[PDB]
Structure formats: C-alpha cells, structure tokens
C-alpha cells in the first residue's frame, strides 16, 4: 500500500561537489516518491562546466530552469554521423544540440548524454526521472552508468569504491577492446579522478560550442518565449509539452507543463485522472491544499522555490499563489495527463444537471444554478478571492 | 506468491445502509482477488434513489441485474453540451444515458459517474472494479471520490470522518474557487449529510427522466433481448461484450461474458488463456470444480445466486447447472478474454492427431477416436450427463 | 530491490527422469532471475520420444540445441483443420510443424504444445520463460498444465500428489463432458502413468512423423544454415530473431540472439539499453566480465556449455572466447533488443566530439583520437589481444 496520508513539500536531501558545479538529490524513499517511483535531481553547473556523459536504466525529462548550452545524445540505431569542418583535420561526431532556459529535454532510458554550460550564470536543471516506467525492467531504484570519471553515485548511492564503467575491467580486455595500451587503459578507468561528474573544460574544448525515430524532436521550449495553450491575462497561464506536441513523449511515456501565477491568482480545483503529478517550485511561493478519496486534507501549507510536491493521481488540488507570484515545472508520469475541473466554464460541475446538484448538495434549484455557473474562468482563476 | 489453492464461493463482507438503498462490498483481502486485483460491489438502489457521483483510481464495468434507470458520466475531453427544454429558462449540462436491466455499463478510471433509479423495483448493480489495472498508477487498493454528500467509504475503507472531497479544503479556496460564500460552502462540504452515497430525489428532480473517444458507446446490453454468440438450443447460452463488440473495452482493458445454463446444463471444460474470470452468480446454483496445475481441485463446491467465484488465469473449470438452473454475469481482465475448449467439435482434444492420443492416455486409437470425437457439442453442453 | 552484484554462471539445479528422457531446471529464485522473472529449462527427450503436451502461464522461446523432430501447437481461435490421408479413415488434426537444430520455436502463454523426437540423435531444447511477461496476469512463478500423464511437476515444483488437468475434477463430470465411461475417465487421468512427461511412443505412432494472427510463422532457424546480420570473417557471429523477422515476437515480447565466438575471438564491451540478456552456453567456454553502475564487477569467472548467465540491462559486458571457440543462445526479454557498443565503428565513444573525450579521460586529442579510432572492427572482434 501506499502511504498518501502525509505529502510534504521536500527539498534536496543529499548533496554532491563537482569540480565545476554540483548536484542536489531528493529523497527516493519519500513516501509519495515511493508510490509513484520517482526520482528529482537538481544539477548546477557553472560556466564552462561539462556534465560528463552517462546513461540510467530509467527516462527522464530535464527542465532548463537557468542558463544555456549545449548537449550531445546518441540515441541507438541512430548513429548520426557530423564532420566538424576545418579552420585540415575534420572530427567525426553526433549532432550538437543546444538548448536554452525554457527548454523541456527528453532522456530516453539507457541513452548517454553530456550537458555543457556556455553561459556566464550557472546552468541549473531539474531532472525529472521516473523508476516505475515500463522501459526500466530492473527495480524501482534509480541507476546511472557514467562513461568517464569517477562520480559518487548518489542518485541512489548505496540506500563504495565506485567509479565509471570502464573501472570495473580487467586491463587486458579495454586493450584488446579498443586497441590501445595500458597507459590510456589506466586514464579510461579515472582512478584518480577527483573531479566527480560535472568537470571544468580545458583551455582547448570550444570547437563544439559554436552549434524515423532518428528525426523526432527531443526538446521543446514550454518557456514564456512560446504560446501557452490555457492563458488568463490577469491569472497567469500553463504550457503543455506532451505527446500531442512532442512525439517522442508518447515512447517515454511521461509529460510537462510548465505554470505562471500571478501574484493571488489561483488554480482552479482539479485533479489529473491518468498520472501523478510531481511539481517543482521554480520561483516563489504559494499555499496549496490537497484533498484524498477520504475527502482527507493530505497536505495544507506552502511550496516555495526549490521545492518539490508530489501530488498523486486522482487526488484533488487547489493552489494559490503568495505576493511574489508563483511559478513552476510539473512532471507527469503519462505521456498524456489529462486535468479535470472541479468548477468553471468546463467542469464537472457545469456538465451535471440542475436537478443533480440540489438533491446532491441539499440546496434549492437557484442556488445550484450559482454553484455551477457562478465561476465563469478557466483552469487559471485572476486574482478574486 | 498468489494463494490460488483453495478458492471460495464468496459473498458480501461489509455493507453500507443509505436513505435510498444500500451498498454491499466483497473482501478485497481475499486470496483469489488479491492475486487478481479486483474488487466486487452490489448497489441496491430503491426508487427515486441516486448513487452521488464519484470517480476511482480504477476502472469498472456494471452489470445491471435489475431494474433501469439514468445515468450521467462525463468523460474528459468530451464537454458534451445539451441544453434542457423550456416548458423560459434552459439548463446546459452532460448527456442523459439511460439503461435497464441486461446492460453492461463502463466506467473508465478516473471518470464521475451518477446513477439514479426511475423503475418501481429496486435497481441491483453489480460493479466489477479491477486495480491491477493500466490505468492506475497508485497501488492495488480502490479509492473512490465522491463529489458530494458524505459516504463512509468502504470500498475499501481503511483495510475517520470521511467525507466528499470538497470537505477537505479550506472554507476561503471554495469561495474564491467557486464565487460563492461560506453559507453555500457548507452546503458543498455536506457535514451534515447523513444520507451516505445513495440519496432520495426530492419532489422536484424529474425533468431529466425524460431522457473520436467521444463517440463510443460506454455500454452494451449482453442480456436475453440481444443475441448471443454462442447458443445451445437445449443447453444454454452466452453473450460477449469485448472490444470487438464495444470499442471502449480496448481502453478499459476488461471484458465480460454473461451466461445462461438450463436445468442440469454443463458449460464443458476449458480455461481461459489470457485473463482471470470473475464470476457473479445472477440466479440459480451450479456445482463449480476447478483444478490446478498440479492436477488438484481448488474449489469443488456450490456457487449460488448472489455469490462470486474467482477463476484464474489458465484454471480448468467445469460447470453444472442444478434444477433451477444456473444465470451469470463474468468479468474479464483483459480486453479480449479467449476460452480453450478441453472436448467439443473445437477443441484442443481435436486438435491432436489420434497417434498422440494414444500414446498420451495409453490407450488404442479406437478408444483415441471416441476420446476427442464423443463430444460433438460446444461450449454449453445439452442436459446429458 | 534486486540483487544485483554477484551475478553466477549457473547449471541445473533440478532434474526429472522421464520414461524417454530428462528434464533439467535452474534455480528460479536465483537473485539474477528472480529480478528478471526469468526460468530456464533443458530437455532430453531421446529417439521416439514425446514430450506430452501442456500449456503454461508464461510465454516460451525454445532453441533446439540438437536433433530434429515434429511439434503441435494448436493456438486459439486458429482451429487449423488437417486430414491425415488414408492408406479408408482419415484423421483430422493440427498441423504437424517439424523442426530443426537452430531452431528457435514460438510457444505464447496458455497455448499447448508438445514435441516429439524422430532423429537417431537425443533431442535437447533450451526453454526460455518469462514470468515478468504481460501475458502472465498470476505471479512470477511458472506454471505448467499438463493435458495427459502424471509429472511431478519441477518447473518451480513446490517452491504431493501432481497431475494433469483431468485428475483432478469427478469422474462424472468427465464422463459427461467427453461422452464416455469411468474405464476411459481412468486412462485419462493416468492415475498410474509412471512414464512422467518425457514418452516412448509406442509401435504406431508414426503415421504423423512424414510431416491474421493465424499465419504467423512460430519460429525461425537462427543457426549454421542461416546469414547473420552480424559476421566477422576471422571472428565470429550473431544472428537475431526479433519482431522484424519474426512478427510474432511483438505479441510475446521475447527474442533472441545466437552467436559464435572463434578460438580467442572476443564480443566487444556493449550493454543492452533496453532487455536482460539470458545467455546460454551452447559450446566451449569463454571469460566473461559484467560491470554495473558502481563500475564494479559483478562477475568476473567463466560460463561453460551447458551453463547460464542472465546479464541485465544496462550492464556493460565483455566476453572472450577460449581456444575450443564459445557459442550461445541468449534470449531477451524484450521483442527487440538494443544493444549499444562502448567501442568499434559504430560506438558511443565515435559519437563523442573529440574536445569531450579529452575533458572526460584527462587525456590529449592525440590521444582522444586514438581512443575512439582505434578499434575498426564490429560487435564481434576478431582475435588481436
Ligand atoms: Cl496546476
Ligand atoms: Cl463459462
Ligand atoms: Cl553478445
């Protein structure tokens, strides 16, 4: 059973210094976390930071909460092939990806990928991974295999002499394998890297900076330089990433919206009826109630930047956002969440009948027609206490 | 490890009175349906009566044993607007879905839905509920949340001042959410609602009774009005509502069979190969045996009306019918459910050559013949034991 | 969570004599299978014997390692009609399906099967089964329901008076069902068949040994006799069975690969992003190295013929062949398997931009260049320690 009595608004329990930036890590065996199989990490990188490449045995969506840069991912099947021109040696390598603030990543499991900053603020991003996904067929324990370095996992950590996994081979076998000698051997396995895993690029690594599965998008900006599908000139508005969108989400099997509240606009009571819905405060604060099947206050306090509220499927949620605003990035475990609302010009309230809503709340034919047609917004209510 | 070896005709374990009606639930505990994941309810609902609506984490098929009456049920996506008639004031709300006795109601996870009584007999529903089902993402225990008045779930209980899911927020949000005051507040909260969840429709409630996902039909009636796909002239029938018959099954995964036998009729041995059977006997008693495969009997007893017996998955079974006959309704778990024959003109005994007989049961090809080619009948086998 | 770090070649820890050969099972709660819901099964069935029929719970994938023979498997809703000629009678049975060493035969859940020795040779085939299938709807424990014979079953045995179907319902019922009497209800049971499920057949039995979902092909020749995808002239190959050569893989999610290792010949590091990787030795023996996300190693030992290792996904993996060769089948739990090479032509370090390999390893482009162009050859590496 799952232990949804008790949700809180959870902040980074564990903690990892790179050389060039650090990573933040929530508590898997949080009881919503638990239930739902999810993981939240944070990565900061700063300038000229690498985030070396690895791969999980789960899929993730990144949201780009500050910063830009570029990212490398292979993706199987698709080697895409590029010849980085002269300046008369040409490199072979894949496709450089940039990405801004805004911007919603996908991560397929078991896919390698690198981030770099090449920015001058740090390069801050939540990673949204989901344990609980039919393409992870291990356990619902976040795993990541880092190709080079020697980072401390601690995405799950041990809940350890660890390193990347070219360190656990026998010496022979990486020289036989890729043809080369016991001094490269020893560089492969990063014995002695103390770097962890974001590192700080040398002087000479830049050439790159400057850029039908295989054709599918891998990201989209849900940020304010694009439309928002539901918006409230005085509320705030919600930007949707989902498979509609972004066709690779429907192979992930997960989604985003991205929300803006203005300062004591509201969202409108709802509830998501096919995923779990883990929000990350991206700025300011706002008070938010949930409600369970008991009919049960399971959370009833604040949310502020930074933070993280695990709001399980099918449960009941009202948030209203403080003075500063409030502002943030919700993973959904479905490549297609589907929102229900309580009340407004599509609600569940609207579509049953008069008749219904008198026997239902005991109260008279006119005072049902105010309960169903009295909030004339949307999902976003403005500022109207 | 699932305990499937001694399984047992089951009734009702708890029951919640109403003002109309009274709501009967199986033991979800019990060993056959927790291997299964499924959970059995019998509405009864007097005349006049309305079950309030509410949504689960799971999804539901509900088999009509009596009676009809109206129903509302949203489905999102689909604002399915209708305006209700002057006799000059107009009402918009939900399409009115009207169904009787013999129909096999869907209810998708996730989804509101309401059910009112306008016949003179009480309306009997017998709501199979399945939560080792796609749609839920949460665990294995059924949630249902109701929107209004205030129901001492016990769907599952607590397996508490349990009330609708409004009466968990916090006066303020539900005046500013749904543009009203406190005074109508409580009216929504319902905390002083002693009727439970099914309710009687006061004097006025009555101008309804009168009346591409969003295109397809949310029921099918499997009862004697319509046909049935396999029929014994002299033995019985049974009618099945699939995705084949009711596209909506492929998104609900379920299914079901309802099922006739005549006096002293046998449904011939066979099992099914992709999904468990979750029989609700409608009327009579029958002498049920089931086996293993360590060749043992896990149930060898009577199944009488009002009773639920749990076939899993590939368990042989075999049916008899008593003097009164014997009348059910089967759930599926699966879309699709596919019944092996043991004997009959299509069967796996006809499937093999006598040569294999032979040698299989260590008898002559004589005896082989009169094996697989005694039994010339079907599925329901003619009174001739 | 799964017991992943110390992974162990593993041989049969169970064995049943038959009256026509032997049936050998590993270790279902070995921790690697365990977590992977995998079940392995060896066969002996020698001249003129016949492996009586039954149906499992489980979707089966089973490489026929030596000999030749006939199989039935009748398939629902497939009544495939046949009338074996005449000599004036004329039978009427399934289609009788001969088969082949490299074969690689189809058995989805609940679909009986039998198979039948007609070489000079023992017949040995390698069941793959996975509990963890979607098809599976009990528990993670293997079940096997035989129609004729008394086995004690072994698949997971108790993990006892074991029989077939048959024995366990009342003799009336049968007699009803099949038309017949108690003399012929005897036979059927077997209540004295001391044979287990491996038969001799008898004098006879021979008549049968000269021989949209409907059409699908149930299995595929992955051996000697076929073209490999993969093939290094001086090194070896494999040769893949999934769901684009075999369509019917799609519906059991299972495939797999067989591969050849010449003297010294080595299998380059790779993981497979998306399935566990159950191998079995066919031939030979080979030093084999698993690591994990730690970067340490969770086998580091030989597997020799006759024995398994389940290596699962995402763990990276090297193997080397020994001077006799090395040779296997390795089934995967997904329809297509995905593997991604560290090095070779098509590797994740060619994908690498030069400027990352060198921040990664702390080594110079020079150097960087060496490192992912060295190696030319392929998945398979022909020797050149
Ligand atoms: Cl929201
Ligand atoms: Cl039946
Ligand atoms: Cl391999």
Same mark, same amino acid.
Request: hydrophobic fraction near 40%; charge should be neutral; charged fraction near 25%.
């Given at each position: 059973?799952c232990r949804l009595e008790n949700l809180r608004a959870q902040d980074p329990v564990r903690r990892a210094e790179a050389?060039?930036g650090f990573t933040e890590v929530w508590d898997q065996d949080n009881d919503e976390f638990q239930c739902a199989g999810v993981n939240m990490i944070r990565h900061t990188i700063?300038?000229?930071?690498?985030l070396?490449?690895?791969?999980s045995?789960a =899929?993730k969506?990144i949201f780009?909460a500050?910063?830009?840069?570029?990212?490398?991912?292979?993706?199987?099947?698709?080697?895409?092939?590029?010849?980085?021109?002269?300046?008369?040696?040409?490199?072979?390598?894949?496709?450089?990806?940039?990405?801004?603030?805004?911007?919603?990543?996908?991560?397929?499991?078991?896919?390698?990928?690198?981030?770099?900053?090449?920015?001058?603020?740090?390069?801050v991003l939540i990673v949204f991974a989901d344990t609980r996904?039919?393409?992870?067929?291990?356990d619902p324990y976040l795993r990541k295999?880092?190709?080079?370095?020697?980072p401390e996992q601690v995405e799950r950590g041990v809940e350890e002499?660890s390193?990347?996994?070219?360190?656990?081979?026998?010496?022979?076998?990486? @020289?036989?394998?890729?043809?080369?000698?016991?001094?490269?051997?020893?560089?492969?396995?990063?014995?002695?890297?103390?770097?962890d895993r974001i590192?700080?690029?040398?002087?000479?690594? @830049?050439?790159?900076? =400057?850029?039908?599965?295989?054709?599918?998008?891998?990201?989209?900006?849900?940020?304010?330089?694009?439309?928002?599908?539901?918006?409230?000139?005085?509320?705030?508005?919600?930007?949707?990433?989902?498979?509609?969108?972004?066709?690779?989400?429907?192979?992930?099997?997960?989604?985003?919206?991205?929300?803006?509240?203005?300062?004591?606009?509201?969202?409108? =009571?709802?509830?998501?009826?096919?995923?779990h819905?883990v929000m990350y405060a991206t700025?300011?604060n706002?008070?938010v109630?949930?409600?369970?099947?008991?009919?049960?206050?399971?959370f009833?306090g604040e949310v502020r930047e930074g933070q993280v509220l695990m709001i399980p499927?099918?449960?009941?949620?009202?948030?209203?956002?403080?003075?500063?605003?409030?502002?943030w990035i919700a993973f959904?475990?479905?490549?297609?969440?589907?929102?229900?609302?309580?009340?407004?010009?599509?609600?569940?309230?609207?579509?049953?009948?008069?008749?219904?809503?008198?026997?239902?709340?005991?109260?008279?034919?006119?005072?049902?027609?105010?309960?169903?047609?009295?909030?004339? @917004?949307?999902?976003?209510?403005?500022?109207?206490?």
């Amino acid at each position: 059973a799952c232990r949804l009595e008790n949700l809180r608004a959870q902040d980074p329990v564990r903690r990892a210094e790179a050389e060039a930036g650090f990573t933040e890590v929530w508590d898997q065996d949080n009881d919503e976390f638990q239930c739902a199989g999810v993981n939240m990490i944070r990565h900061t990188i700063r300038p000229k930071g690498l985030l070396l490449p690895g791969f999980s045995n789960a =899929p993730k969506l990144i949201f780009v909460a500050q910063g830009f840069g570029i990212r490398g991912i292979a993706i199987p099947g698709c080697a895409e092939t590029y010849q980085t021109d002269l300046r008369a040696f040409k490199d072979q390598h894949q496709k450089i990806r940039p990405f801004r603030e805004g911007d919603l990543l996908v991560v397929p499991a078991g896919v390698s990928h690198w981030m770099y900053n090449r920015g001058q603020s740090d390069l801050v991003l939540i990673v949204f991974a989901d344990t609980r996904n039919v393409a992870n067929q291990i356990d619902p324990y976040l795993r990541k295999f880092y190709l080079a370095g020697r980072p401390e996992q601690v995405e799950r950590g041990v809940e350890e002499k660890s390193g990347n996994i070219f360190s656990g081979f026998a010496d022979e076998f990486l @020289e036989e394998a890729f043809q080369i000698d016991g001094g490269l051997v020893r560089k492969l396995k990063g014995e002695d890297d103390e770097r962890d895993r974001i590192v700080q690029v040398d002087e000479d690594f @830049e050439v790159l900076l =400057p850029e039908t599965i295989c054709t599918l998008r891998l990201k989209q900006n849900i940020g304010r330089s694009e439309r928002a599908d539901v918006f409230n000139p005085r509320g705030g508005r919600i930007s949707t990433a989902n498979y509609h969108t972004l066709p690779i989400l429907r192979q992930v099997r997960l989604s985003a919206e991205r929300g803006v509240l203005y300062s004591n606009a509201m969202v409108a =009571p709802h509830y998501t009826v096919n995923s779990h819905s883990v929000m990350y405060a991206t700025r300011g604060n706002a008070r938010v109630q949930v409600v369970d099947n008991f009919g049960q206050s399971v959370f009833d306090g604040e949310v502020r930047e930074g933070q993280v509220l695990m709001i399980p499927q099918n449960f009941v949620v009202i948030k209203r956002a403080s003075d500063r605003g409030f502002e943030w990035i919700a993973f959904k475990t479905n490549d297609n969440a589907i929102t229900n609302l309580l009340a407004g010009r599509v609600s569940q309230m609207r579509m049953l009948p008069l008749g219904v809503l008198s026997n239902m709340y005991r109260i008279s034919r006119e005072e049902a027609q105010r309960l169903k047609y009295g909030q004339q @917004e949307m999902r976003v209510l403005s500022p109207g206490r």
